[PDB]
């Protein structure tokens, strides 16, 4: 409320004049170090834009994966921003923003086929040569959701991405991170982000439990950020999408 009674974390931040952002600095492309050992990445950029929305300075507080949750609970920083995946273990002890990225499996295809394979429907066709490694989630995704396609099983150390590029297969199913990396590093390949059933996880900003005020601010701000195209530019800049 305004005819209000209480001070919130959102007030503490405004009164102190700094947003303390917990981040690991060991995770490209979200949070890492440039050639000088300053913070760089996707969520370093976002962090700065959140501080600026608030009218405050950003202060980056080093944390590590092993102490992320206890640092957050011990009020070392106001928010964790650093490609944090939303996991049940993490939600037990923290609140998450709405998701700013979804991920899981991502098809990797030739560059000129990018527009051609953009849905499950486009991919699950009998002329489509699908490539996977044996024995894990890539193979199981294909057997489950791509039954009309011609699925070939390779081996884990084979360069399957290169089978796609050279035209010996059409679509490689792999984790998002790998798709994105092979597409960025090969001029002939493109990664196409598709929603369910391909996506199975999400990334969010992690906040201490019980302050709906800051969390609501963040969520309104994320949505504003989506709406004006800022996440698109970030995807482009950092994910080379």
Report the nearest approach of Na ion to the CB of residue 192 (Å).
12
Q: What secondary structure does DSSP assign to 119-161, as a single string?
A: SHHHHSSTT-EEEE-SSSHHHHHHHHH-TTSEEEE--TTS-HH
User: Which residues contact Na ion (rule: CB under 5 A)?
Assistant: 183, 189
Q: Looking at beta carbons only, is 26 or 159 nearer to Na ion?
A: 159
CB of 236 vs Na ion, minimal distance in Å? 13
| Neighbouring C-alpha atoms within 13 Å toward the C-beta of 127 | 3
Which residue number, 181 or 214, has a Cβ lying nearer to Na ion?
Answer: 181
* Closer to Na ion by Cβ: residue 48 or 184: 184
Least Cβ distance, residue 217 to Na ion (angstroms): 37
What count of other Cβ atoms lies within 10 Å of the Cβ of residue 41? 23
- Angle, helices 212-227 vs 230-239, to 10°: value is 80
Least distance from Na ion to the Cβ atom of residue 183, Å: 4
Distance CA 114, CA 149 (A): 17
Q: How far is the CB of 113 from Na ion (least distance, A)?
A: 12
| 47, 60 contact by CB (below 8 A) | yes
Phi-psi label, residue 52: left if phi above 0, alpha if psi -120 to 50, beta otherwise: alpha
Which one, 61 or 114, has the nearer CB to Na ion? 114
Measured from the CB atom, is 131 or 189 closer to Na ion?
189
Residue nearest to Na ion (CB): 183
Q: Which of 95, 83, 114, 93 minimizes the C-alpha distance to 201?
A: 83
């Amino acid at each position: 409320h305004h005819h209000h009674i209480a001070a919130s974390r959102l007030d503490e931040i405004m009164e102190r004049g700094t947003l303390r952002v917990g981040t690991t600095g060991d995770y490209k492309p979200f949070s890492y170090r440039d050639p000088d050992g300053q913070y760089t990445g996707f969520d370093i950029d976002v962090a700065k834009s959140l501080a600026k929305s608030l009218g405050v300075k950003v202060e980056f507080v080093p944390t590590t994966w092993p102490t992320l949750m206890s640092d957050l609970q011990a009020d070392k920083f106001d928010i964790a921003m650093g490609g944090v995946t939303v996991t049940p273990e993490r939600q037990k002890k923290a609140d998450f923003s709405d998701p700013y990225m979804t991920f899981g499996k991502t098809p990797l295809v030739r560059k000129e086929d990018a527009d051609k394979f953009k849905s499950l429907e486009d991919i699950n066709r009998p002329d489509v040569r699908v490539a996977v490694n044996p024995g894990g989630t890539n193979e199981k995704f294909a057997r489950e959701h791509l039954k009309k396609a011609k699925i070939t099983v390779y081996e884990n150390n084979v360069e399957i991405f290169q089978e796609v590029a050279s035209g010996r297969a059409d679509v490689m199913i792999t984790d998002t991170v790998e798709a994105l990396y092979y597409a960025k590093k090969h001029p002939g390949l493109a990664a196409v982000l598709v929603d369910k059933p391909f996506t199975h996880s999400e990334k969010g900003y992690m906040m201490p439990k019980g302050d709906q005020e800051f969390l609501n601010y963040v969520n309104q701000w994320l949505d504003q950020m989506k709406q004006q195209g800022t996440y698109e530019k970030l995807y482009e800049k950092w994910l080379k999408l």
